[PDB]
Structure formats: C-alpha cells, structure tokens
C-alpha cells in the first residue's frame, strides 16, 4: 500500500506513487522526474490526472504513451492553482525535467517535497526564501558523512581533458559513454563539443533526448554512428566482452576505445581524489569510472537543511531498514543543535 511518505496531508495529492493501483482519495498524482523507480506503474492505460514539468510530460507522452488529456504540465517558478491548492515547481538540479514541489495548504502549512535533488546555494535565493516551510520531504540518498564528492564542473573538466588528449594523440580512438536513464548528459555533450563531434546513439536513446528542450539539440546528437566519434552505449554493455564486440562492429574504423562510466559514489571516493583516478585496461580498450553525481553530497544536503530550518523532516530514500532510519534521525538532530532552529 502507498507509503505515508508519498502522501501530502490535507490534499488529494500523492508524489511519485504510481505502483499501488488506485490510491483511495487521490485526485492528482504528481511526478517529480522521469526515473523508473519514481514512475513505476504508468502506462498508456492511466486515466487520472498527472501533474509534472513540461519535459517530464514530453517523456510520458512519447516514451510511455500516456494520453495528452491526462498529462498536465506546469511551468517552473510560477504560482499555479491545482484543484484549489496553490503549488510551485522549482528546478531540482537532478536530471532533465526534475522538479521540487512547494505546496501551500489552505490551513497555512507550507510543504516542500524535493523529489530527487542536488542541493545548491542558488536555491537559497529562489521562491523558497520568501516564507517559512514547515515540513520537508527529503532526498536522503547520500545522508552519511563519508559521501563527499567533487563539483560537477570539476568532474566535467577532467573528462574534457582526458578525452581531448587521447584523441589528439590517436585520431583513430573512440570515446564511448555509458548511460541507462536520462541524467548526466553534460558528461557526453561536453566531450563531443571539445572533440568537434555529434554524439551517436541508438534510435530509442535519440528518442529520449529529443524530448528534453535542450537548445540546438539537432546540432549535437545523431543516429548515424559511423559519422561520429563519441558514442553512447548501454551501461550493461560497458565492459571488455561488450566493448571488444562493439569495437568489432564499427568495421576497422577505430583502433582504441576510451570509455567513461559516470557513477554517483563508489568506495574509492574515500581514498583517492579526482585528479588521480585510473582505468582498467584489457588491450586497446580503457574504461574510466567517474563520480558524476546528480544527488546532494552530505555537506550539500546539510547546508541546505540548516538554511531551510524546517519544523519536520521526512526522508524518502533509505527508509527500508530501522538502522538507516535511526542513523538519519541522529544526523538531523546534530544539524538542528549546531544551528539553533
Ligand atoms: Ni532520480
């Protein structure tokens, strides 16, 4: 049954709750972003309102085939009335189309649901700054002090450099980039731009990217693999048995694959910096794992929460075990005591 942490008190509203059938008393199902654990349940046979960003609506319509009439996109940063309740959608700094939602209840309570987010200082000067928020439904994916990671701009810098040097040394080298969902487009789009290439991909992956309101996208992606030296493949295929094979498929056109795997955190974050990363090499192929995150670091989350000073915090990730729940509450208390809310 729909968990309590996906229900907004004093509304007929639920958040990211599509896999429990008809939720009793739900007049509106919000969707924060197009990642499968969050949309699990939607199909062409959904006949209840869905409220989401414009980009998310393009993905619902074109990838899952939901019918134009049941998709209600809202603009960002704009006060909207939904079934007699004022809401606002804010950019979550997660994947394309991902939002946070602000709900202003008739009784005067104000609730922020983060969806999935990477907290940033720029959020402290958004519409959030204009009033008190009482309840915070929080993306706690990396809510532990070991989770440090660098800035996206640092990680993208590294990648642009590795690739440029490798291709300038060997003009017949391929850059491959691993993907499974939307997210992390900047990794591959940045490398393509330094190399003067479009990024080549399958027809389904091209389909996904054409929903995203990226400007000038027609100049940046293609379905013609042969014309292109940055390629996207499945992350299930980013390995030696899979790369070798893929290098065979190109028809004696490249003699070296340099590939990137953009992961959130892995335990080699604790001991090695970004400047001093190495790859795994079997022959002419080399695979690099890069810590590109679209979720808050521990410190990023902590700063945001200490600035917001909510009266109550409900975690939405890592809630399945008592040990995890207990561990997060301890951090929340630490934070509150240090700050004096
Ligand atoms: Ni997500």
Curated annotation (Swiss-Prot):
Highest taxon above the source species: Eukaryota
Protein family (similarity comment): Belongs to the DNA repair metallo-beta-lactamase (DRMBL) family.
Expression tissues: Expressed in brain, heart, kidney, liver, pancreas, placenta and skeletal muscle.
Function: May be required for DNA interstrand cross-link repair. Also required for checkpoint mediated cell cycle arrest in early prophase in response to mitotic spindle poisons. Possesses beta-lactamase activity, catalyzing the hydrolysis of penicillin G and nitrocefin. Exhibits no activity towards other beta-lactam antibiotic classes including cephalosporins (cefotaxime) and carbapenems (imipenem).
Native source species: Homo sapiens (Human)
Protein name, entry field: DNA cross-link repair 1A protein
Induction of synthesis: During mitosis. The mRNA encoding this protein contains an internal ribosome entry site (IRES) in its 5'-UTR. This 5'-UTR generally suppresses translation while specifically promoting expression during mitosis, when cap-dependent translation may be impaired.
Subcellular localization, as worded in the UniProt entry: Nucleus
Result, substituting residue 139 to N: Impaired nuclear focus formation, reduced interaction with PIAS and increased sensitivity to cisplatin
Subunit structure: Binds constitutively to TP53BP1. Binds CDC27, which is itself a component of the anaphase promoting complex (APC). Binds PIAS1.
